[PDB]
């Protein structure tokens, strides 16, 4: 009776929250070794107090891949419940 395209957006968006922390846990394809970067610095004149430190936690990053939500969403957003339901409640059906 009541609709089923409208309520896959629920379990859309309740599958994606989860390939949010797979996508920055694993942030790999096949566990590939890639190549990795370096860093440097410079000696600078004079004298002072010079330290950092940074902290936090929220919901999604909207300013580090909200480029790629759109994109990955964009997978499931078009998925039957099964397939998404079935992914966040963990259970073959």
């Known amino acids: ?7 896959l957006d629920k379990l859309r968006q309740a599958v994606l929250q989860k390939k949010i922390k797979e996508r920055i846990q694993n942030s790999l ?5 890639g190549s990795g970067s370096g860093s440097g610095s410079g000696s600078g004149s004079g004298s002072g107090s010079g330290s950092g430190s940074g902290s936090g936690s929220g919901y999604q990053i909207e300013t580090f891949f909200a480029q790629d939500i759109e994109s990955v969403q ?20």
């Open 29 to 33: 394809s096949t566990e590939k070794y």
């Open 1 to 7: 009776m009541n609709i089923n395209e409208q309520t």
């Open 74 to 93: 964009k997978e499931l957003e078009n998925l039957s419940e099964e397939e998404l339901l079935a992914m966040l409640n963990g259970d073959q059906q």
